[PDB]
């Protein structure tokens, strides 16, 4: 922990020098000249171990690493070299580890507005790996966020930023971290739901995540995508254009198939989504009747899982109360 103490001192000294240069507005500090990259690299590596994290937190390590990330982004923006990219990656990983399950760390980082804007800005980085790193931070920050944190996460545009990011990512690891953060953020409030739905191509994209073929034998993408979809389905139900996007990307059939998943998360997400979409739309009700939704949902009403039991029963009630004309023996 003498070592950790020395690394954090180097970082704080460098930041002070940066803040001094900013306040003057004596050449512009460059991270390479103070060997910042090895310093953060080492702290990042230590941060995977829980006992080292506790040592790091005694030294205000989260605050110092965040301050470094912020001042580099401010100084060099996204018109920056690989040393700076590397630095932000290793810083971001440390912040991910340090915010995991830590009430105080999450609240501190979300109160750092400048640092928050800087994180969001990195979702446009040329390093897609850096994007994944930032989305991992935002994922943790958005889990069990207090009132002030939720407000800041919204006000710095994290949701639109993450949704836009998702549309351009080429790699599954990036998509996983980006969707996981969106899933958490989509639960915070109604404006977040609206902002997700307002991004052009987002609904079609989320529908596509419902049948993602993970080459790592995992359900993470389908879970987070279906989770986002379930959280925004309340608003989608009010908008006929948005319902139509879902229809023409085969959302309804896929959701029925989700009802049979071994993942309770997938079944719960599907029940929640079907609950909302089965409300007040004759044509979606009719489509769901035609695909045998009624018996499918009836099979879940006695679930142990409270959201599957209430969602399945609510969707079933919407269908049972609106038996289509053609079903009435006929006519």
């Amino acid at each position: 922990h003498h070592h950790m103490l020395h690394l954090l001192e180097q970082i704080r000294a460098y930041c002070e020098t940066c803040w001094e240069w900013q306040e003057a507005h004596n050449p512009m500090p460059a991270p390479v000249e103070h060997q910042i990259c090895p310093a953060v690299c080492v702290l990042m590596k230590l941060s995977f171990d829980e006992e080292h994290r506790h040592a790091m937190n005694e030294l205000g390590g989260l605050q110092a690493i965040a301050e470094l990330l912020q001042v580099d982004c401010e100084m060099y923006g996204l018109t920056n070299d690989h040393y700076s990219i590397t630095l932000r990656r290793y810083a971001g990983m440390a912040l991910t580890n340090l915010t995991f399950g830590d009430v105080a760390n999450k609240a501190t980082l979300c109160s750092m507005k400048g640092c928050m804007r800087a994180l969001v800005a990195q979702l446009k980085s040329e390093s897609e790996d850096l994007q994944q790193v930032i989305a991992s931070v935002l994922r943790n920050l958005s889990w069990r966020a207090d009132v002030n944190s939720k407000k800041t996460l919204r006000e710095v545009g994290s949701v639109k930023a993450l949704m836009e990011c998702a549309l351009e990512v080429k790699k599954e690891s990036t998509l996983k971290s980006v969707l996981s953060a969106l899933w958490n953020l989509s639960a915070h409030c109604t404006e977040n739901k609206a902002d997700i739905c307002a991004v052009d191509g987002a609904l079609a994209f989320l529908v596509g995540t419902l049948t993602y073929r993970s080459q790592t034998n995992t359900l993470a993408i389908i879970e987070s995508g279906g989770g986002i979809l379930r959280n925004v389905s309340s608003l989608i139900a009010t908008n006929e254009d948005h319902r139509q996007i879902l229809r023409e990307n085969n959302c309804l059939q896929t959701l029925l198939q989700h009802l049979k998943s071994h993942s309770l998360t997938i079944v719960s997400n599907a029940c929640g989504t079907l609950w909302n979409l089965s409300a007040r739309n004759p044509k979606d009700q009719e489509a769901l009747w035609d695909m045998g939704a009624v018996s499918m949902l009836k099979n879940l009403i006695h679930s142990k899982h409270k959201m599957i039991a209430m969602g399945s029963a609510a969707a079933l009630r919407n269908l049972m109360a609106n038996r289509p004309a053609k079903y009435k023996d006929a006519n």
Binding site: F48, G92, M93, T96, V133, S136, R139, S173, W183
Partner: peptide, 7 residues
């Protein structure tokens, strides 16, 4: 989604 250490 929950939260996680960096992966």
């Amino acid at each position: 989604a929950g939260e996680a250490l960096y992966e």
